[PDB]
């Protein structure tokens, strides 16, 4: 029993946080092998108009100091590829598990280790947002910190930080340098556009509710797919497709209540509110659970 | 920006993790130097529960009826002890990847990360707290007996807590690391319940004060309150008494907002008066009782927005 925020262990992803430092800023690196990856505003008045192929062609390898642990990692090459600086280093990380460079979708979640001078501070479980930005918990010197799952004993590395958004909310790109939604690396005005509920997350976490006791707000009700998309657009809810009533597949048949069912349910609290009571501990409706997560957390897999 | 809960990273406690087998009950072991510390109900039958002699029922055992595996390592056991509700296993080989440790035992209010693990191996990793009836909210399936509650302040890796049981009301019970229980609480199938929990007082306080340093201020007031009157109303909420030594521990937050201790208690009983009428703090509707002012301190900035 219990139903928990619950990150992935970070064992494998802490073995390879190195510092990396040019001239005055400071930022987190990702080191698999012999190439240590981070954000190209590493290289820097300069974030008004960067051109990064300018900036980076006057750099050379000893500029960038790298810092693994107490261990000064000599560096012997260096590329960008899109807002990824890559800099390959002399030694290969003894310490580099086995991993992916995976590109995930708003709705997804995953797990991010926060580090600061290339040191894990901490640990937290968090999901892309449909408008592409992730609430965190950054403070400055948290560039470079990365977001991962964990599939078997494979690390999928999804995001690595690169800014903070005027709403306190952040942005970052994959591991291949591509940022998730609408953001530039550079000082300029931007701002998140407006967010929605992950209505498939909502459904998964009503399950999980139900797994472990709590059904106060299952009625004998049901609903069309069309009827609810027409009431969760209402209320800034993401539509409901046919893809993700076939992913609750396995919840709807461990508990006996029908996707649809539990969108009549999902309805019901949507047009009238809790009334005072709590699902999961939770005065609001909770979507950074996604079906895989629930099932996952409901059956003990381990890594 | 932003106010996660955030659990400290589990890579140094990762490496301690080990499967205890002994007959047909397998649960997770802490492997730290030469010792392998589990829970001793890892040498029990569901029949023995009951009313269980643990000294009767270990001095029938040797070294070779329990098995311990590392990764794929099968470790030989050359000594068993049991200190109170833990046994510990000796080992014949120090486990290379022990990290800086400490065992320490927590307060009711204290936070901490679990690495909850089955069969030796960690699943995920979560953070929470002892409440004031000695209960953690944690989330256990069968076979996370034995997973363990740490803080990682610097380099060194505080052990706190080790998974025993789980109480009829889906809540959880167990030991400091010399395996002293928490609470009044029995290593037996009895009946035992939880006691009436309570809120955690001065950390609803520090994640008030994280709120106001995030740039939040909608749920202060112009009043002030006595010790003494603010104790009267929290108590009929159930929240935990606040003491003086609340008070002086939240003295750095208060010099960081520029609000006095018994001014965020007035707008505390308002908020417990009123409710939030659809606002949030820090994203939640409900007032959050699991960051201590530590906690707070550690993760917000050192600068009010
Ligand atoms: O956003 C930036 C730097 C920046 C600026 C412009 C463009 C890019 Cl790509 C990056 N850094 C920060 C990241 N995460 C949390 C922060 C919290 C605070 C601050 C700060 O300096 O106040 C900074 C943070
Ligand atoms: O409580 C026990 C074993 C036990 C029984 C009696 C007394 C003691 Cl000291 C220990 N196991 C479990 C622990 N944590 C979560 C569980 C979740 C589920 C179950 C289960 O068996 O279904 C079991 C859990
Ligand atoms: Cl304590």
New interface residues.
């Given amino acids: ?12 992803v ?2 390879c946080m190195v510092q990396v430092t040019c001239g005055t800023t400071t930022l987190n690196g990702l080191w698999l092998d012999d190439v240590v990856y981070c954000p190209r505003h590493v290289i820097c008045e300069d974030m008004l108009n960067p051109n990064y192929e300018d900036l980076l062609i006057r750099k050379s390898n000893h500029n960038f100091l790298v810092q693994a642990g107490n261990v000064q990692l000599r560096v012997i090459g260096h590329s960008m590829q899109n807002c990824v600086l890559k800099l390959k280093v002399d030694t290969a990380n003894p310490k580099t598990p086995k991993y992916k460079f995976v590109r995930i979708q708003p709705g997804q979640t995953f797990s991010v ?2 580090c600061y001078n290339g040191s ?5 479980q ?1 999901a892309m947002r449909p408008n592409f930005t992730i ?5 400055n010197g948290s560039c470079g910190s990365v977001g991962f799952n964990i599939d078997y004993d494979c690390v999928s590395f999804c995001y690595m930080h690169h800014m ?1 958004l005027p709403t ?3 942005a970052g790109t994959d591991l291949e340098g591509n940022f998730y939604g609408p953001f530039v690396d550079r000082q300029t005005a931007q701002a998140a556009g407006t967010d929605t509920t992950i209505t498939v997350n909502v459904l998964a976490w009503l399950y999980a509710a139900v797994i ?2 709590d059904r106060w707000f299952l009625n004998r009700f049901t609903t069309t797919l069309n009827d609810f998309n027409l009431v969760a657009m209402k209320y800034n809810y993401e539509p409901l497709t046919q893809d993700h009533v076939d992913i609750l597949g396995p919840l709807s048949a461990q508990t006996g209540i029908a996707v649809l069912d539990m969108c009549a349910s999902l309805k019901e609290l949507l047009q009238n509110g809790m009334n005072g009571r ?1 699902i999961l ?4 409706l909770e979507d950074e659970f996604t079906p895989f997560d629930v099932v ?8």
């Fill in positions: 029993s219990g139903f928990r925020k619950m990150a992935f262990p970070s064992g494998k802490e073995g280790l926060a894990p501070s901490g640990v937290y968090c609430k965190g918990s950054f403070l903070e306190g909310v952040h472990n006791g709590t501990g939770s005065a609001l996952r957390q409901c059956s003990g897999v381990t890594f």
